[PDB]
Amino acid sequence: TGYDLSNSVFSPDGRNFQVEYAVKAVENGTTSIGIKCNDGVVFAVEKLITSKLLVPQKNVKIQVVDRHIGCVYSGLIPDGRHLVNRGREEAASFKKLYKTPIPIPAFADRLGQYVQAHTLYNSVRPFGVSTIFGGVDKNGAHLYMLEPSGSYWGYKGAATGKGRQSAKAELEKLVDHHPEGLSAREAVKQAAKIIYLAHEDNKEKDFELEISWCSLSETNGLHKFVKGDLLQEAIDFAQKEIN
Amino acid sequence: MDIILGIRVQDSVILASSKAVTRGISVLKDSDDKTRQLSPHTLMSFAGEAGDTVQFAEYIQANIQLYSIREDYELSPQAVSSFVRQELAKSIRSRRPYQVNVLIGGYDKKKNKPELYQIDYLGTKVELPYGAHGYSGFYTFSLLDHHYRPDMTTEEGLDLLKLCVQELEKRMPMDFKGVIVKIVDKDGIRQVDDF
Amino acid sequence: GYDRALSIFSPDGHIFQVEYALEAVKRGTCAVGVKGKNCVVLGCERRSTLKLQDTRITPSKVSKIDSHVVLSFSGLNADSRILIEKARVEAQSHRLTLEDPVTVEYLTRYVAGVQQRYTQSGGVRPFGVSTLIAGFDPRDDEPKLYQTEPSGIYSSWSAQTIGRNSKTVREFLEKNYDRKEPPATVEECVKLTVRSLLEVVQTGAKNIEITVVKPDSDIVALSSEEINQYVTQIEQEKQE
Amino acid sequence: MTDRYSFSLTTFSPSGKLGQIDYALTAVKQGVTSLGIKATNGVVIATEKKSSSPLAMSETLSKVSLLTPDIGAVYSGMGPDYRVLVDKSRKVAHTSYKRIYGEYPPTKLLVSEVAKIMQEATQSGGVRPFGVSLLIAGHDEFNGFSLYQVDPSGSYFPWKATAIGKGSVAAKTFLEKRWNDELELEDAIHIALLTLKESVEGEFNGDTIELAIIGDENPDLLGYTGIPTDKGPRFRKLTSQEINDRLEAL
Amino acid sequence: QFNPYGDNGGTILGIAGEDFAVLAGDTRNITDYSINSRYEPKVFDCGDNIVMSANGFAADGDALVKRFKNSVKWYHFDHNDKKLSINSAARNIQHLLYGKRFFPYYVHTII
Amino acid sequence: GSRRYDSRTTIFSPEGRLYQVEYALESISHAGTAIGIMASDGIVLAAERKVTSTLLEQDTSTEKLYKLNDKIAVAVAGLTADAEILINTARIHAQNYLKTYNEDIPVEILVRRLSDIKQGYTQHGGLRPFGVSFIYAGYDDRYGYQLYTSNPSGNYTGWKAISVGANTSAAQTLLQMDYKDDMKVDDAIELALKTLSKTTDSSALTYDRLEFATIRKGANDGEVYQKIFKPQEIKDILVKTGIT
Amino acid sequence: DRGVSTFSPEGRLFQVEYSLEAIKLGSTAIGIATKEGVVLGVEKRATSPLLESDSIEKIVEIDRHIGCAMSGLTADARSMIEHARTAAVTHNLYYDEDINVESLTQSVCDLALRFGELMSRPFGVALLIAGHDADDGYQLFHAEPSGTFYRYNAKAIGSGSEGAQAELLNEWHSSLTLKEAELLVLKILKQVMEEKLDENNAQLSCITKQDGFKIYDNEKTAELIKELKEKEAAE
Amino acid sequence: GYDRHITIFSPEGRLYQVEYAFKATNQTNINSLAVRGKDCTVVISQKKVPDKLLDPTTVSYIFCISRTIGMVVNGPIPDARNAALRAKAEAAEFRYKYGYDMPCDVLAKRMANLSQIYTQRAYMRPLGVILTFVSVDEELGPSIYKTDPAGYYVGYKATATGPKQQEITTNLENHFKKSKIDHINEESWEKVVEFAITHMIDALGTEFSKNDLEVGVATKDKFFTLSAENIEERLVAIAEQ
């Protein structure tokens, strides 16, 4: 064989094994989730505390693109940064030419085509991340998840990393017991719980929580981080729910 | 620069070229040799823009010597003249063109003939019995039109030349400090030391 | 363009393509240079599996770089044409800028550098050639002889040989050449050159070339007869 | 990124074969048969429109292509490789001939260009050879009628008549028997139709057979009148109907 | 047509004693007949006990001073915190200036 | 990445050979034989077509002999498509030399450059060499009549008589035997054919399996003429030397 | 094969490590630093008796205040010297001052790592760069194809080196005279050299603040060679 | 053998990478079908949403390439979108350079030519997709042209693509054996869409709700996709038959 030693080579199945192997690196990563709500989206991630020497709060993993888009990823952290930098260039260029800030679906394809472009040649390596991102545009709220193959879709909720299934389950529950919609502040708590719940699959090391959100009404359309009293409030909600 | 002349007689080509080099109101030198040996039987006199003249002469010289060594053979005067014309014809449409006029006097050994080529900075070539560049021509062409004969000896050509230089010294407005004369024939290139 | 590193190191610290270029040299017809008190001679074997040749027009084995310097070689012939051209051009360039013909050391140093550059650039294999370069510095009577090899190393030689069976003739020259007294005339030096080739050659037929360089750009190739004389003359001295 | 394949993909084996040209010819072998016959006043090229499905409209798929008003081509091998060669062949007739001389290239020369492209795909970095052989048929004023074959190596040869692909060994044999130096164009069309029946399996009619000629000038096909020295193309694709007419008197 | 230069006026003065030196300049900056500022200093401390002034077209002067300052920073980084001697500073400035021979810094410089 | 699929066309064997050159030479050895014989008053080029079909257009054809300029022609042995690339290069080069110097190009200078081009493809750029060997037959006023061969290595040499392609070893022995220096064009014409007649892998030589050309002083006083034999003319020269 | 910029599993670069091997096959070179100057010496190692040994140039001037000895593939050094000389002269032109020995060295070591798929392989030669500058006095540096240089009081490189180095570890002290150190170099060379040390097959050189970098002629060294045998006989 | 990894010939004159690219074509396990009305061109494709966390509306393999051209993709979505974007670009440039709307067949050829290149040039892989282009061309009438990874393309009376593609193909063949004509002789596109769905149902032996499908329609001067409700109307009208 040898079909899996070079990126962009089709196997006789129809597969590009190098991409599939990139997915393994994703699965090996810490958990991250996105929840879509009525007028916005919420992003949360698990930050393992490798050591007591990690300054708390000071190794931020959620990234903003433009003023209205949040991105979070599981897998190789530097690959994620590369992809956001590209996202930032893509959004800048779009705004420069068309004046309006970049639509979330429009933005997802920019990331989509660029990641896909890294499955076309043996001289590059596919992206070692699955990325959850989204925001609020003139049409509403949008959540996306994007995978090393360049495959992406719109999500009601989404997760990736080691706790991917535990979270997937928890999200199916929410979608099922909220056909009419979930609120922004509600979705923030829920997210904190789901990160705590899916920390079971990652549990030797304790961790730090981190949430952010875009709500038309609660953040005015823009992307902010959740800290202070609204953070601690949701840490508590999740403390309760696991006991 | 200024005065460069060539007369081709029966058996040789003679090149006479003024010795003065002037910048402003100072004759900086009175013993300049405005010529370069391209091959043992080809000589080239040059006149024109300060700097360009010698840079061009030596550039052409190097190319011909490189050819001489590569093929272990000497190009005909006709060939060298066609190469030098082409170089100038190139140059005239360059960002900064060579502003140089030349004469190429050579003895073709396959034909046993002397040959004289006049080429201006534009790359305009012509084979002549006698030739000149610059204001010199205005006096010498008519003079030679009268006094020159196809079958003249090298000695007869040199007196014909004296007639040219005397007339130039009578009527030309500037002091060009005499000339250096050189003869190209079957036995190569030599210089008359007293003119 | 084509990038690949073709000359790379092996775990033992050898550059295999350089060493394989040396194999190509060892296969090439022999050449030797011997320097006199007052001259230098370049001798060259001519592989004898070839009758119906036209030697008027077949490329001679010793090449003039300038009127005062010559270069002979062993190895790939086509490779050597490239080095020679480059050298000839550098010779003319050096006259243009310094207003002086090259020294034999300088020219050799140029050629050696070209060979070396081909041992650490992408996309190219080294030159399958080693060279003997010979002549007299301008306005200098003391003879010069140098050797270069594919790796790029170069040095001076009282006399030296390269090519197939060169160790055999180096053998002979090491025992027949006294530093203390070198071949004091042209005659003598051409002689020691021919005897060294007759160790390895064959007959002295259309088989040995000789070129002689004297100071002030005084270079001439010998022709069959004059060499043949040298040949016949050594064989009668040999009947001992 | 970019083509970092700057080295040759076709190289000499120790036997001195060029593997990829050999294999490209093997791909030609598999291909559907096509042929060319040269009459005294015409040239005929023909092939089978072996449809992919009965749901496909095979008029939309042209195997025989005009290159200049007096040159046409046909192939055996890989369809998509032929399509791009026809594109490049049409353009090179302009860029490196018509736009210089104000007239169309003669057959051998246009053919010569095509061969060059195909040769280059056999030596350039990062490419495989084309997987087709071409039959080019044409007329030019000083050379008359001609017919050429171009192979993946980039080699070409002039033919009185020949065939390529699947049933070519059989067809070449058939053509030797029937070809003479006195054939009128209609006779050669007739022979081409017989020769082709050997190699076609199923249906054999003016819908499964593509067939064009290089013959007389066609003023009706010019598009305009009043330059009486402009007489129109010599290339004409025979109609579905036209082919069936000649199959009754078969 | 765009004129890429201007003249901001002022004047500078340097004197050297036995064991000291002074570099002085007025603090007025002008264009045409207007005052832009009454205190805009143009003699600077550049480190390693060098002071510098680049009088004429301020934009060019601020660019040069900024560059020379930065030249000092890198001299330290590249030559193990060695002190830039005044003679070497001078030569370094010759190169900064002559580097713009065909689009000059419209300044008269003193250190 | 891509390095995996790189053949490395420009490397040495540990024996110091260039693999791809050796294999190209091996390719060439199966090609129709070609022969140049140089006489004192002209040159012959004769070559054998790779095995014909009766349906080939014989007169409107060239496979072996190509005109470079008015004074120089080549006989080809190897891939034809490769050869044409090199030929147009050579043709252009001859024209540049004329434009530059107003003199027809010396036969050797043209051969050196074509050989130099070939050499390049063996030392740099990772492409395959051209699978082609030439015999050059030409005239210039320095060396008169000349014969040269060049091969894929980019080596060229001069000859009185020489063959390339198939059966060179056989052919070179036969030529070595009967060639003499004082020989005339028409004797050479005869030698050329009688050698192919003996070395051929075919049943017998017939006009339709040959290309044939001469370069003689055969015009009007001190001027050279290049004749590419029409098919009828080859038929006649075959009768006339009693080979048919 | 495998890329030219590849890491081994121990975290070392194959191509650099392999170049280190080629340097071990090279001729011996020794340098010693003293408060009175720095000495550089080398094994010339002529591969045949016919080759003229003074044409073997393995000690080399970089500037008046900087010199160089080499060991390994010495054809690779030419361009490194070229770079060094340009760097030095250039520095002087930009700053009207001598370039520091450390800086010269760093500049050369920057060249070293610029290879891959820039040149195609690392260099196969080690350098001893030695000279004087006002700020840090007499210095000796060992420049490797890895991009790293080390300051030494004394150092040897080439085939005879590990033997020669252990030897230098004993004999070096902070108060060596120039003349004492000249001798040490000769001594240790004769020990490790295959053939028998004379004034043709080895070469000496030093660099002092007062007279800069000087290569010693064959006559001057022969007298130091004699002077060393007389010392060795007398105990 | 490395003749398996890049787009060079195998000893039997074959391009494995091209063949393996066709196999990726079915990787999504979706079937598609296209037919022509008198006035229109209809393309249908199955819609399968596995995960319940997905936004159903963001899941599609039909694209609007231009005002007048629609394209349905059989193959993985990343390659599909890559092809969609390229074709959109290519259709716009055509308009700008030549001053009329790019025709279906031409765009098909141009995209075919592009895939042909990846079969010949080694650094580019082929796209694991099959592209079915549809429009009502102003010169040619209703049109279906289809492209594969080999670089092949042709026009169809009708066509299907997918794993169960052959069933649908013969189903249609049989209709045209019987009908005698080249198209669905029907007035409104609504009925041509109904025909499409109906015959996919017989051929596939399955039943569809409104969210099991996707429907593109091309008319003279626009190509539009149908909403869930538009299909439901069409399903219901089929049921009451």
Added chain:
Amino acid sequence: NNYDGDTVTFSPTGRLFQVEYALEAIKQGSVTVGLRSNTHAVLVALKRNADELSSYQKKIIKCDEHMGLSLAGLAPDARVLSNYLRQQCNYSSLVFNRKLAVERAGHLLCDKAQKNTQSYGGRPYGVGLLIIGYDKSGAHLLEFQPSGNVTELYGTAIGARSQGAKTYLERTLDTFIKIDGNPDELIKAGVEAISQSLRDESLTVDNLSIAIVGKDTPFTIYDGEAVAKYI
């Protein structure tokens, strides 16, 4: 194993072996330590010599007045990266008249390292770096690894047998964090912590290297007699 040829290849478990091999050079590197209070950040590094006749390889580099790093692994790669960083600190000054945030210095290093792990023919950096700085939000310490991963810490160590110092620092946390406004006291904890990684040898004068930066002190370096104070 079959997947360690280059950086552009993933293993079947999803790893990049050329990166992990690059990480290995760090582990072979001599130990260096970093830690900070709220008012200062300190680097202490152990320098390694070739033999007793050689100098001791410098391990600390200044990037700007307010920032600098220590290295462990391939030296030239640190020189390249420290040089890049000097440029970025400098660009930020000249253009924005702004000292470069240590947090940003981190991101830039990460993104530079990352590119060499995704493209053919490149190679990852074979060095680890500890960056300290005093910027607009106080004292800072950073750990850079050539995987691209950059991390902010109160203290840490890298190199050979760094794990001792790293656990010592994990214990000593609440003591050293509050050594505010006493420079020599913070250095002692650095020197103490580095000692948990010494084996068979201990700290000498021309062997030890310390750097400090903070509130009213430029990034400056001590070696030789200047460190005698601390052994």
